[PDB]
Amino acid sequence: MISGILASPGIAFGKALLLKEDEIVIDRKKISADQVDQEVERFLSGRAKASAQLETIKTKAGETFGEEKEAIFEGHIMLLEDEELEQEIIALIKDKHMTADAAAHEVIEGQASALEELDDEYLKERAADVRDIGKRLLRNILGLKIIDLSAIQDEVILVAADLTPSETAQLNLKKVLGFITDAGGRTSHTSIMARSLELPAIVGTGSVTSQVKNDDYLILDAVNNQVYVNPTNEVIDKMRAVQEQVASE
């Protein structure tokens, strides 16, 4: 069966919300000096947008967990608005005729890679949080569609290979029912939430994302540590009684 680490006990019912991501296609075409000036505005003014987006996520981190976590996202903006990283991006766009999408990808390529060369498991995890800041910056230049997990409209379960502080900082715990992630870390951020929020959850699912799909009907037991996919009405009716018999006790 599906054995995870079990974060907290409980039973919930809901449709599976799988978090997939659309692959981004960067154009490696060389532009002309007549399109370079336009890229700077699309890149400079673009930052005006990404700055407003990450900024809005910053307050959701302080209004959701408390200004105590705003210090982490506060630095995430200084790096994005870094006046130094901007002069380097600009040059490439003007010197190597690179697209704001391509050039910006170059600097972000050494930021994450260079962080792996550091001798600190901490700055390393920042590498993952940094790639997220770059990927978002890209979808902002192409104005690509973004998933709005901050405004769900249907109560469902949350399933994902893993969730980064940002996803957890914008997640709306107003219509959520539970969290399931492929993180087998006895100290995974997901668990810290499921643990502090006392809600029931699991994280060592491992590869449930390779056996489940979005909209799939699931039933979390968090009692025997097992996920049931499309069970018979005989097991549901039997669990609907016991489970609800608990809330009634």
Residue positions annotated with a catalytic role: 189
Coil, strand or helix at 181? strand
Question: Can you read off the two tokens belonging to residue 9?
Answer: 């006990």
User: How far, in Å, CA of 154 to CA of 9, rounded?
Assistant: 23
Query: Is 229 within 8 Å of 209 (Cβ atoms)?
Result: no
Residue written as tokens 């009405």? 233
CA distance 154 to 17: 10
Dig out the tokens for 114 from the structure. Answer: 């260079």
Does the CA dihedral 236-163-135-43 come out positive or negative?
Answer: positive
Selection from 160, 151, 153 nearest residue 178 by Cα? 160
Q: Contact 185/203 with Cβ under 8 angstroms?
A: yes
Residue linked to tokens 């599976």: 16
